[PDB]
Amino acid sequence: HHWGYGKHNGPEHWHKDFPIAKGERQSPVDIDTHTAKYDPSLKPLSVSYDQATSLRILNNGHAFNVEFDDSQDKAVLKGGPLDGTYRLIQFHFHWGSLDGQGSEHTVDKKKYAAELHLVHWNTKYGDFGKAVQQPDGLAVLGIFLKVGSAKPGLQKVVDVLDSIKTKGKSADFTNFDPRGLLPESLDYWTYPGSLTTPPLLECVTWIVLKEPISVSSEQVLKFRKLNFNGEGEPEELMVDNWRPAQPLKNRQIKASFK
Numbered sequence: 001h002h003w004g005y006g007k008h009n010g011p012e013h014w015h016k017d018f019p020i021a022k023g024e025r026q027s028p029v030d031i032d033t034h035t036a037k038y039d040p041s042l043k044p045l046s047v048s049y050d051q052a053t054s055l056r057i058l059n060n061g062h063a064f065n066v067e068f069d070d071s072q073d074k075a076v077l078k079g080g081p082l083d084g085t086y087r088l089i090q091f092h093f094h095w096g097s098l099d100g101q102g103s104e105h106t107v108d109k110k111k112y113a114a115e116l117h118l119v120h121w122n123t124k125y126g127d128f129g130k131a132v133q134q135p136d137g138l139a140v141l142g143i144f145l146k147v148g149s150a151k152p153g154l155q156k157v158v159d160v161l162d163s164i165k166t167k168g169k170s171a172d173f174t175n176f177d178p179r180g181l182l183p184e185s186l187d188y189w190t191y192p193g194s195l196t197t198p199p200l201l202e203c204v205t206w207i208v209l210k211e212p213i214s215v216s217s218e219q220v221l222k223f224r225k226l227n228f229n230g231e232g233e234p235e236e237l238m239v240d241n242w243r244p245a246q247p248l249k250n251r252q253i254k255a256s257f258k
């Protein structure tokens with residue numbers, strides 16, 4: 001039936017409806033730190049989120065998305081390995097049922113408790129819908145979360161989760177500043193890959209930050225309280241919404257640092 005993360009509609013099944021699942025530039029991957037090449041020609045990333053306009057938070061049945069007004073160059077990403085300007089459209093998380101799993105990307109096979117994805121689309125394409133059809137249409141910033149100290153900047157999100165418990169619910173979510181989710185350092189790895197949920201289009205330039213952010217155990221616990229199901233359906237907790245690591249194939253992971 002429709003795709004999800006269960007035993008019967010899980011990631012091992014996606015290929016039947018999205019043959020691209022077995023493509024040559026599928027994401028996520030395992031980042032082998034000793035095999036990543038330092039590339040001195042990579043410029044520093046430029047994150048400009050000071051004018052960010054969040055609008056809404058939605059439970060889509062596979063994660064929760066915070067959405068931004070992308071009608072103008074308000075929250076953009078540029079520099080790094082990118083050409084052109086990429087506008088922030090939404091962010092969402094991938095997490096586990098236990099602290100020992102939940103990230104999509106791994107580092108030397110280490111899994112983190114969660115992974116944040118900030119999705120941006122190439123302004124040369126005019127809209128998101130057109131950008132996913134291009135090899136350089138999207139740029140995704142991935143950030144790992146580990147359990148330790150609470151992240152103050154994440155609490156606003158945590159607190160609205162009760163109001164969007166089941167698939168299809170949404171809530172006004174204005175004045176959220178995504179700068180409160182960045183680590184101190186912007187060092188990163190980059191490789192060409194895809195979206196990690198169907199349609200699995202190979203339109204992404206991934207930018208995965210080296211430094212994780214810490215969240216408290218209690219912050220991560222509130223994530224695990226969401227549902228995959230719609231209201232009035234039997235309860236299926238929203239956990240383990242992560243796709244395992246895919247073959248690297250013909251690709252090189254570049255590092256912005258040594």
Ligand SMILES: [Cu+2]
Nearest residue numbers: 002060061062
């Ligand atoms: Cu769906």
Ligand SMILES: [Cu+2]
Nearest residue numbers: 092094117196
């Ligand atoms: Cu994602």
